[PDB]
Every structure is written in structure tokens, then in C-alpha cells.
């Protein structure tokens, strides 16, 4: 049974190792690895509760573990049905993340890049670092001040909020810094 | 031995429960709870490796677990000595966090609020949401457009970077949005 303990040790060790390089340098491969890695936390939690409930000798702790496993499974299925409700409308793979059900669509370089967004703030920042665009902690790619998006969107079940570009601030040679004020909330 | 399994189940359940309320509404109490909660991940990882190594029957897996426990302990002590090197200069409690060793000092309402900062970007955003100031995901407090800081600092072992306020953008009634361009890097 120590194999599962060594597996959780490997998981914890690599997750700790994730907190020295990937937190600063944001790569799409590393981000999606971290995302699917957080998505697998729910089944391993359920597995821990299951292996706690299999060896039931007394009924108090076993009943507590069974009730909590039922609750966490119910809320996991609630999250699954929420992600299904989102994906039935926005039709985006990033709607199946365990982080949030709030989507950010940015039309950069023609392709619509979709990223998870924390809370859909009324004003959304856009920061240019050495010609690289980042919005809400997501490095969308290499976009200098000339090709900045004009209008982006925030997608949600029965909600689409349009965000219009504000003023652009050219400073420190090539770095730029701009705001997205909320325009309107619709569902056509 | 199932008590430790139920403890890790409680930890995972409450950490999953943390991903529905505290991620959107940022409270200082909830943030510091999450911070000390991430700080206790290192000893529980070491404990998992220790309980994997105590029941050594074969030598291959036991040796692998012992070597990995030694490596994770060595890097944990490296992190401890890094935090000590930081705290010997900046003298701030927030230097003892497992997230980052990059400090952000903001002079808001007279008191110098210090927060962890991800990577010390050359341009730092400041967003006003309903009269509340947030910088790099940290809700520093209630600060409208009038009392915005003039100059903030980023603290680091043998580094202090001064950040000067840029242009201020008043939009949507009371919301504001401003930039901190890097001024100079010193250590006096």
C-alpha cells in the first residue's frame, strides 16, 4: 500500500518543484500541465477517502468519511455540470478547468486566445513587458504596442461582457500599459 | 494509521472548498490562512516520505524515497536560508512566505503595506474597483483615486527598486487605473 504513499510523495515533490520556475516564467505547456494537475486533485482526494472507508472497523469515523466523500463527490459533479453548462454555450476547451468558470477571449494575431479569468473585474489590465502582452497573469504572447487588441470579451453561462480598450500609455521605450473598461453585458 | 489519511482528506477537502469563495473575494485573513496552509505543505510532504521510508522492506524503493526526502529537505533548508537572508535586510514578516521572495511595499494610508509579489515586473498595474485598490492580485484596501500612492518599492536581498506613478485614468465614474514604471535599482 506504500506505492500510493510514494505516488503522493512524487506528486507533492514535483508540485513543490513547480513553485520555483513555472510561477515566474509563464509557459503555456507548464500552465496546462499545472491545470490538469490541479484537475487530478479531485480524484486523488476521492481515492484517499475511499481507502479510508474501505478499512472500516468502527462506524463513527467510517460514517464521517463516507458522508464527506459523498459531499465532495456531489460538489465535484456540480462542478462537472457547471462546466458542461458553460461548454454548451461558449464551446471552448478551457471551460473544463478546475480553476474558474469565467472565460477571457482576446483576439490577438487573428486567433482568439481563450484563458481562465479570476473574477471578471470591471476594469481589466494589459501589461507589455519587453514587447510581450500579459493580461490577468496570462502571457497571451508576443504583442507590441502596435497590435494591441481593440475589444476583448468575457464569456460566461448566459453572459458575454464586451471590454473596450481605454487609453494606451507608451513608456520606457517599448513597454505599454492599457485598460479594458466594461462596455455592455449581452447574450444574443 | 488511517488517521493521517483522514487528516490529508480533511486538508484536500478544505483546500478544494477554498477554490470557490476565497479565490474571488480576497480577504487578508483568508490570504494569510492560505499562505500558512501552503507553508505546511513542505512538512507534510516530508512526513509522507518519512512514513514511506520507515517501513523499508526492499532497498530500491527505500533508497529512492530516502534520496528524494534528502533532496526536498535540502531545498527546503535552502528556502529557509533565503528567507533569512531576505528578513535580515527588509525586516518584514511577509518575507517568510512559501510563495515568493519578492516584496512589494506600498505606502497607503500612512502604513506601509507589504505583500508578496510574483516576479517584480518592470511595469506594475494598479486597479480601482468600486473605490478599492488592488495591485498584482492583492487587495491593498479601500483607496479611491485621490489617495493613490505616489511612489512604491519592491524589496529584495541586495535590491530595492523604486516604482514611480505614471498617468492616472479616471473612467466609469470613480474607477481608476494607473501604472508604476521602474525608476531605479539601489541599495543604500
Q: What is the DSSP string of A77-104?
A: HHHHHHHHHHHHHH--GGGG-SS-S-EE
Residues A27-62 as b or e (16 or more Cβ within 10 Å = b): eeeebeeeeeeeeebbeebbebbeebbeeeeeeeeb
The secondary structure of residue B93, as a DSSP letter, is G
* Rounded-to-integer distance, Cα A77 and Cα A71, Å: 10
Q: Resolution limit in angstroms?
A: 3.5
Phi, psi at residue B74, to the nearest 5°? -65, -45
* Rounded-to-integer distance, Cα A148 and Cα A176, Å: 9
* Rounded-to-integer distance, Cα B33 and Cα A127, Å: 29
Give the residue on A whose Cα is nearest the Cα of B6: A52
User: Which positions in chain A touch B166 (Cβ < 8 Å)?
Assistant: 169, 171, 177
In sequence order, which residues have a C-beta less than 8 Å from that of residue A93 and are 6 or more positions away?
Answer: A114
CA distances to B50, B105, B154, B156, B178 from B163, rounded to whole Å, are: 45, 10, 8, 14, 12
Q: What pairing do the DSSP bridges indicate for beta strands A159-168 and A177-186?
A: antiparallel
**All 3 cell numbers of residue A122?**
470591471
Question: Which among A24, A118, A125 is the nearest to B119, CB-wise?
Answer: A24
Terminal Cα distance for chain B, rounded:
54
Give the residue on A whose Cα is nearest the Cα of B24: A119
- Please indicate whether, in this complex, the C-beta atoms of A119 and B24 are within 8 angstroms of each other: yes
Closest CA to A166 of A143, A184, A182, A186: A182
**All 3 cell numbers of residue B36?**
500558512
User: For the packed helices B41-54 and B2-21, what is the interaxial angle rounded to 10 degrees?
Assistant: 160
Question: Which among A52, A166, A169 is the nearest to B171, CB-wise?
Answer: A166
- What stretch of H or E contains B135? strand B132-135
* Rounded-to-integer distance, Cα B125 and Cα B121, Å: 9
Q: Taking the CA atoms of A142, A145, A146 and A151 in sequence, report the sign of the dihedral they define.
A: positive
- Please indicate whether, in this complex, the C-beta atoms of A16 and B42 are within 8 angstroms of each other: yes
* Rounded-to-integer distance, Cα A45 and Cα A39, Å: 11
Experimental method used, please?
cryo-EM
Strands (E), chain A: 103-107, 112-116, 123-129, 132-135, 138-142, 151-156, 159-168, 177-186
- Give the 3-state DSSP-derived string for B67-80, with helices as H, strands as E and coil as C: HHHHHHHHHHHHHH
Give the residue on B whose Cα is nearest the Cα of A39: B16
- Please indicate whether, in this complex, the C-beta atoms of B2 and A61 are within 8 angstroms of each other: yes
Q: How many residues does chain A have?
A: 188
Amino acid at each position: 500500500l506504500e506505492q500510493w504513499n510514494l505516488v503522493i510523495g512524487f506528486l507533492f515533490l514535483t508540485w513543490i518543484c513547480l513553485l520555483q520556475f513555472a510561477y515566474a516564467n509563464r509557459n503555456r505547456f507548464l500552465y496546462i500541465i499545472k491545470l490538469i494537475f490541479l484537475w487530478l486533485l479531485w480524484p486523488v482526494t476521492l481515492a484517499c477517502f475511499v481507502l479510508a472507508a474501505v478499512y472500516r472497523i468502527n462506524w463513527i469515523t467510517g460514517g464521517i468519511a463516507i458522508a464527506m466523500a459523498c459531499l465532495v463527490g456531489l460538489m465535484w459533479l456540480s462542478y462537472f455540470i457547471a462546466s458542461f453548462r458553460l461548454f454548451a454555450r461558449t464551446r471552448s476547451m478551457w471551460s473544463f478547468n478546475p480553476e474558474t468558470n469565467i472565460l477571457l477571449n482576446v483576439p490577438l494575431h487573428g486567433t482568439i486566445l481563450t484563458r481562465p479569468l479570476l473574477e471578471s473585474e470591471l476594469v481589466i489590465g494589459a501589461v507589455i513587458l519587453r514587447g510581450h502582452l500579459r493580461i490577468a497573469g496570462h502571457h497571451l504572447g508576443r504583442c507590441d504596442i502596435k497590435d494591441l487588441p481593440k475589444e476583448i470579451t468575457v464569456a460566461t453561462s448566459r453572459t458575454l461582457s464586451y471590454y473596450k480598450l481605454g487609453a494606451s500609455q507608451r513608456v520606457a521605450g517599448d513597454s505599454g500599459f492599457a485598460a479594458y473598461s466594461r462596455y455592455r453585458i449581452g447574450n444574443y
